[PDB]
């Protein structure tokens, strides 16, 4: 609550210096009026505030909007810092002690479990990130300045300077345009998510483990965690996922996957280069002695004058510096090899001259470790050496594995053209049992099918291309090959074919994507049918993985229905696997907002059926969230902490399995929910009309968050639209009726709901999330958009919804036993209280802007300029909307999303 | 005394945890014992240790030697922390206040003077760094872990993980052979001293400067210190100084001056890259709008796939990023250019393709700074953009300038031979008057001289070739050409010629190096003569530099004499200059030890004739001192602080000019101090034998410190010798007599001696330095080497010096009015008490070790190996001296060197 006033005060001043009191006063007022609204709760303020803003001139409007955006951002920044300081002044050491003590588990059990556990976090570039790298940068700088600013040992002059620092970064950020003017490229996006790896996660992982070691010893286990074990791994979709996005061509993958390999190569060099300086021992293994001597006579060259450190030949007097040096040289060709490959077509540098596999890079390293531990000096080995070893297992030769995605109907096109051409029918019109026949005969065969004279097609080729590249690059640089909207088992085979048929060394594994409601239901079906194919079941080798999507599930049905459906689905799927003895691991397509399956990490894991993780899980970090989770130091350390602590516990101390009673009621409710949902968003004709009216869903594409070039469509904008209007329709629409039903059915059921909310994790967490949403909603604000945009005829329709909101919230609070929303979290409300008034301003602002943009005959009374006098307006060359209107709008969305902490 | 134990304690725990509880104890005992002598004086106990020590197995002798070495080392580490942590609770701001407040100066007068001040700190690689470069890395590591381990906001886990690291690091340095086996190379030496630049000084400079900006504000001036103004500058000798060192071929010169530019260009990139992410405003100069418009308009729309950031074309909406990006590329070439010129022979990268002059590089950067200013974002410009500008004006493209040093005679060798080969006789035999006449006319001629067919010694080449390398390399990468042993005006005119006769664009400026007493006295004349030759005066352009040695200077003549002479030297020289209106600046060849003109920065600059410094001053940093003065960041900041402060005062608050009485008496004691001096080193053949008899001089080389191979000895080895044996004979020799004499010549002089040590800065510092010297010398250890290595013959001669020593020390304390030594510095004495007992033990282990070499028939009763065991000793294959002696001797030196915190 302190830093808040600090960052804000600072900003307000800069504002005044750059633009003069007049304007600083305006922003100052807006807050006041919004306050009276958020405080006394009198709706007259919103209308008054509206008069204040509709008068502003283009430049002032763009400024005013921008001003609130920055203040809001700052708020979030202050909050992070405050959270960090507090909580230091959850934790594995905790969960271990708790598991061993309370739950009582042999430390060996823990240790083992820990060893056999792996949480793969895959970053994805879903258009969920609003801020641009430019501002995200200034932020990390302000965070850092704000921290050192609270240093309890900095002199006077010291502080004085740090302050000046904080201010100019604030001003610099204020001075840059936050409206990304062009759509990013797939390569640019990968360069974004990558920034975190070589800036916070790279040197983070090793530290995280050091703590996981300290913890282990604190529980008795006087043994560090083996460096080969990898508790957490990072994968990426930036460059691999090409579903619905034509811009991710097969070359884009070569480039991004090559560039990433160069970065790793580069990082490790700094590692080794120094490591050499540290391992200056001479007492070595009988084994290392040999290995070293050989490299001594083999090199013989020392003329490397361009080497800053360790230029002339290293004497065998320093055994490790010898091997390390070698490893380094090979590392340079690996970096340069890639450079050329990227720059020109090829490289003079030979394949054998560089590292092409992880084993090739480990053998030398591992050697030093053994040598050290053997010749005594183990501790010296457990130092920087142990850290590097861990990095290699976590990051490997290409910072992160790359997944691949593509809707199967594309694979059908390819396979169909191949059959048509060869004169053997239309694979398309083939019955599933027929396709499985042909496809299985082929997989068993030995004779090539891919005809060289095959008639290509931009897409029929774009897909073959992808596969080829998969063959070019190493086997390790890739993750699984996901098949969007793929149903029948033939769909998984058609890919198994193309992989080998397009020549692929170690064909990557195939994993289906069950997201649409329907697919999630018939999910355990296709799953079993697939384990019934001998060939497959045989090449699979026990290990199997399937991806479950959280976004579209509740888009076509309720949130409640979907939430339960995904539970059931991954619940059964876990048996259809257990029955066929396959280690099925689930890939969770969790978003940023609760509406798309998001929410606190430990809670989300706890809400998953018992016995369906067992130390193996993949989870998506959608764009925006990457910032949230690994933006800072401590932040990253928490995300890693959180994930492994939850996954570990969910295994050795599973959640409760739903009582038969609950299941029945749950299944029954889910129906009511979906019937309630589809009834209004689907069955109601004029709904969509009302939808594209009371919300800025239409203007979503203007922000330019991604590189993807209507009722039945898109989900990110869907969630977004109501998050802006602060209504959250989608997140709760079902729940209203689902509850009233279980009660109107039998009065005693109410006591059941209360029973569930108190004993069933899935259910408590599900409700607990909806409370947070309601805590960020405001039917008042929703009404304003209605009144201003929604037509007269359907005006009353809005009110109905407005009522369902309230009704659902009461029911929600009763079941939970809360007399007040977020009655549980006091600080979470404190924050809101400070924020809300700023958000409410941007709301009213957005509301009237849309009003002006849509109704060109909406008269307004223009006020006199405020800022000291525009090119600020000329920043948007050709705009379809009049003057400041566009930029202003993009700004409001930018900020409202900021204050809310969520884009979509 | 805090870490003083913390560190030592863990060392032992590791020591016994690695070699057996016995060795830990033995080492303990040897201190326990030696602690008694230092606290008693009965040299009787000493003999005991000697017996035991020599009776240790070769392997154990090493271990026991290294232990006391690594221990003593630690003491120096814990002491560096004990100072920071306690000081963190001299200063320019202070000095600026004291000047405007107390001295009554105009804040504008102080600012102005600060803009015209400059302090060139010249790093050199003298064989003074008796520390392994591989060991230094680990010391820094330790210091860092010691500081952090003593924070307050760290947790228990944090503390345990840190203390854990701090040990594995101490164990790392121990498990590493501290004796360098292969002698260094000129390239390896420039590399050692260079690390400090990019590892500390590169970032340090901008910081120190901002602070100065802060100070200037904290006293009035609300304007920053212009970025083009450089308070400090960095220069090197490493690769340019070839005096006395043959191994520095003219190739090594281009070699290092090339590598340096590759590093400079390199560092600049990391900076510029970063600053590209910062400056992201869209507002700019009409000038910059135009400029950036062109760059974007041209240079295609190319993408650089191997570029991590800003790979694609930059939009012109980011003016600053356009220009800066172009600077980055220009930078990448420059970095690649030199990279090639080193490794291969030439480069494809064009001349225009990269940066050649600082102007090319500045022009753009300055364009931005002014653009940001004009457009209101001065506060933004003063951020990272200023720091870079400050670096550019301080490091240039070379990073550090290079001085070239060659003995005067070596230039005669050439000129003499190019006359002998031509018609006219011999230069060498010509009278000085002749030399000037000829050389002058020759310099005014138009017809060549240097004959093609001229024969060439392996020496006449090494000098003429060097002159060619200077022709090739760029003018900005060179300092002056320093003529060691400068004597007469011809000496300068000879290089003035040779230079033009070997073809040089910008003939480096030539500067005399008056180092022998003889030349010092005559110096003022020479300097005036050179100002007399119209030709020279015209090429001088008003400025003039002249170095003055301390090392060899105090060699021929006693310390006192030399010290006084040097004063008069610069005293008159200044007057001469002043007479001809020449901005004479002096280059100070200050050593590391008091014997080579060492001591506290401020004290030193203080003890210099008033009105000789003012504008500028150059100072050397002899190898060992570099680690000192720039080892840590806090060290660097303070060093910069010290110089600029001291230097600023000496200008506005000059010291007192000696009183005629003082002058006279000084001159007198001067001759008396040399008399007693040379009389024992020159006018005595019995001496030379005692030297090689009592001090381990002939062992200096066994350390492979630098690459450089009676009066035939250098300064360093000289002092090194008497410093190990704790006698420091060369530093106090003359003094004793100078005093006694003036005490007899008259009694009123005792009151005049005291009267001087109170009011005259120079006379004070000199004695104060001495007191420290004596504060380290112990005649006990002095004579111990007699009864062990001194010939029974001149055994008394030794005891005769013993009495002069003690007589001198006594009289000193009398003049200073002190009871004890360092009486006025409880900290230091407290340090000797805890450190000495260790140094002693090493002296004991050294005096006997020298005998086990000098006297083969020395019977010593062996003992059982204390450690748990061969290969240790077999680390030195080809060694003349028996088993563990070769190594133990070098070790005992290295160890004592650390104890005394000085070598040469």
Tab-separated table of C-alpha atoms in Angstrom, chain B residues 256-406:
chain	number	residue	atom	x	y	z
B	256	UNK	CA	47.860	-7.070	-27.830
B	257	UNK	CA	46.823	-3.741	-29.383
B	258	UNK	CA	44.641	-5.806	-31.692
B	259	UNK	CA	43.126	-8.128	-29.137
B	260	UNK	CA	42.357	-5.119	-26.951
B	261	UNK	CA	40.368	-3.470	-29.753
B	262	UNK	CA	38.496	-6.713	-30.282
B	263	UNK	CA	37.491	-6.678	-26.620
B	264	UNK	CA	36.642	-2.974	-26.618
B	265	UNK	CA	34.428	-3.276	-29.702
B	266	UNK	CA	33.008	-6.395	-28.162
B	267	UNK	CA	31.967	-4.748	-24.867
B	268	UNK	CA	30.443	-1.822	-26.730
B	269	UNK	CA	28.096	-4.184	-28.527
B	270	UNK	CA	26.613	-5.690	-25.351
B	271	UNK	CA	26.017	-2.110	-24.289
B	272	UNK	CA	24.597	-0.690	-27.500
B	273	UNK	CA	22.374	-3.759	-27.895
B	274	UNK	CA	20.917	-3.068	-24.477
B	275	UNK	CA	20.549	0.650	-25.017
B	276	UNK	CA	18.540	-0.227	-28.142
B	277	UNK	CA	15.870	-1.843	-26.018
B	278	UNK	CA	15.731	1.177	-23.778
B	279	UNK	CA	15.485	4.176	-26.125
B	280	UNK	CA	12.118	3.374	-27.690
B	281	UNK	CA	10.503	6.820	-27.866
B	282	UNK	CA	8.922	7.984	-31.097
B	283	UNK	CA	9.690	11.714	-30.652
B	284	UNK	CA	12.873	13.222	-32.080
B	285	UNK	CA	15.034	15.945	-33.717
B	286	UNK	CA	14.295	17.203	-37.218
B	287	UNK	CA	17.935	16.332	-37.638
B	288	UNK	CA	17.571	12.793	-36.310
B	289	UNK	CA	14.228	12.311	-38.080
B	290	UNK	CA	16.055	13.022	-41.284
B	291	UNK	CA	19.062	10.866	-40.405
B	292	UNK	CA	17.054	7.865	-39.272
B	293	UNK	CA	14.787	8.369	-42.261
B	294	UNK	CA	17.755	7.777	-44.559
B	295	UNK	CA	19.063	4.703	-42.780
B	296	UNK	CA	15.610	3.106	-42.852
B	297	UNK	CA	15.100	4.277	-46.425
B	298	UNK	CA	18.297	2.436	-47.405
B	299	UNK	CA	20.255	-0.554	-46.002
B	300	UNK	CA	17.413	-2.651	-47.448
B	301	UNK	CA	14.730	-4.321	-45.342
B	302	UNK	CA	17.083	-7.230	-44.611
B	303	UNK	CA	16.709	-9.575	-41.654
B	304	UNK	CA	19.588	-11.065	-39.692
B	305	UNK	CA	18.443	-14.545	-38.680
B	306	UNK	CA	21.351	-15.021	-36.255
B	307	UNK	CA	20.488	-11.807	-34.359
B	308	UNK	CA	18.844	-12.563	-31.005
B	309	UNK	CA	17.116	-9.179	-30.768
B	310	UNK	CA	16.011	-6.765	-33.470
B	311	UNK	CA	16.550	-9.388	-36.173
B	312	UNK	CA	14.148	-7.785	-38.678
B	313	UNK	CA	14.002	-4.289	-40.048
B	314	UNK	CA	13.268	-1.576	-37.498
B	315	UNK	CA	10.287	0.732	-38.145
B	316	UNK	CA	11.073	4.458	-38.386
B	317	UNK	CA	8.505	4.979	-35.563
B	318	UNK	CA	11.490	4.080	-33.432
B	319	UNK	CA	14.025	6.722	-34.596
B	320	UNK	CA	16.437	5.973	-31.797
B	321	UNK	CA	16.401	2.273	-32.563
B	322	UNK	CA	17.090	2.855	-36.252
B	323	UNK	CA	20.283	4.897	-35.751
B	324	UNK	CA	21.432	2.744	-32.818
B	325	UNK	CA	20.886	-0.443	-34.764
B	326	UNK	CA	23.154	0.824	-37.537
B	327	UNK	CA	25.773	1.620	-34.936
B	328	UNK	CA	25.417	-1.970	-33.705
B	329	UNK	CA	26.154	-3.454	-37.076
B	330	UNK	CA	29.077	-1.106	-37.707
B	331	UNK	CA	30.135	-2.467	-34.332
B	332	UNK	CA	29.808	-6.159	-35.256
B	333	UNK	CA	32.129	-5.640	-38.194
B	334	UNK	CA	34.777	-3.848	-36.135
B	335	UNK	CA	34.677	-6.739	-33.718
B	336	UNK	CA	35.034	-9.224	-36.597
B	337	UNK	CA	37.633	-7.169	-38.385
B	338	UNK	CA	40.202	-7.406	-35.602
B	339	UNK	CA	39.116	-10.969	-34.857
B	340	UNK	CA	40.413	-11.797	-38.354
B	341	UNK	CA	43.536	-9.663	-38.318
B	342	UNK	CA	44.553	-11.659	-35.252
B	343	UNK	CA	43.675	-15.250	-36.224
B	344	UNK	CA	44.352	-15.067	-39.982
B	345	UNK	CA	46.307	-12.376	-41.820
B	346	UNK	CA	43.683	-9.947	-43.067
B	347	UNK	CA	39.912	-9.520	-43.224
B	348	UNK	CA	37.223	-9.299	-45.870
B	349	UNK	CA	35.397	-6.784	-43.650
B	350	UNK	CA	36.132	-3.369	-45.186
B	351	UNK	CA	37.703	-0.316	-43.622
B	352	UNK	CA	34.527	1.690	-44.060
B	353	UNK	CA	32.522	-1.310	-42.925
B	354	UNK	CA	33.573	-0.686	-39.321
B	355	UNK	CA	34.502	2.054	-36.876
B	356	UNK	CA	37.948	3.540	-37.335
B	357	UNK	CA	37.799	6.773	-35.314
B	358	UNK	CA	36.014	7.703	-32.132
B	359	UNK	CA	34.351	10.518	-34.053
B	360	UNK	CA	32.552	8.083	-36.362
B	361	UNK	CA	31.305	6.297	-33.266
B	362	UNK	CA	30.420	9.412	-31.300
B	363	UNK	CA	28.656	11.439	-33.935
B	364	UNK	CA	25.577	9.105	-33.779
B	365	UNK	CA	25.457	8.651	-30.004
B	366	UNK	CA	25.673	12.393	-29.536
B	367	UNK	CA	22.923	12.861	-32.110
B	368	UNK	CA	20.607	10.903	-29.839
B	369	UNK	CA	21.545	12.593	-26.585
B	370	UNK	CA	20.832	15.999	-28.061
B	371	UNK	CA	17.630	14.797	-29.732
B	372	UNK	CA	16.352	13.483	-26.419
B	373	UNK	CA	17.296	16.771	-24.793
B	374	UNK	CA	15.630	18.953	-27.375
B	375	UNK	CA	12.460	16.877	-27.204
B	376	UNK	CA	12.130	17.093	-23.429
B	377	UNK	CA	13.534	13.736	-22.380
B	378	UNK	CA	16.820	14.948	-20.965
B	379	UNK	CA	16.166	12.766	-17.923
B	380	UNK	CA	16.025	9.799	-20.294
B	381	UNK	CA	19.184	10.771	-22.107
B	382	UNK	CA	21.017	11.079	-18.795
B	383	UNK	CA	20.265	7.425	-18.201
B	384	UNK	CA	22.150	4.678	-20.004
B	385	UNK	CA	22.934	6.844	-23.007
B	386	UNK	CA	25.107	9.099	-20.841
B	387	UNK	CA	26.964	6.204	-19.197
B	388	UNK	CA	27.904	4.936	-22.644
B	389	UNK	CA	29.043	8.375	-23.775
B	390	UNK	CA	31.161	8.549	-20.622
B	391	UNK	CA	32.669	5.178	-21.501
B	392	UNK	CA	33.410	6.140	-25.088
B	393	UNK	CA	35.331	9.267	-24.007
B	394	UNK	CA	37.248	7.183	-21.454
B	395	UNK	CA	37.978	3.887	-23.251
B	396	UNK	CA	37.800	4.768	-26.957
B	397	UNK	CA	38.006	1.926	-29.458
B	398	UNK	CA	41.160	0.532	-27.857
B	399	UNK	CA	39.946	0.340	-24.266
B	400	UNK	CA	43.384	1.477	-22.959
B	401	UNK	CA	46.236	3.369	-24.640
B	402	UNK	CA	49.681	1.846	-24.898
B	403	UNK	CA	52.979	3.360	-23.839
B	404	UNK	CA	56.190	2.297	-25.562
B	405	UNK	CA	59.363	1.988	-23.472
B	406	UNK	CA	62.957	1.409	-24.633
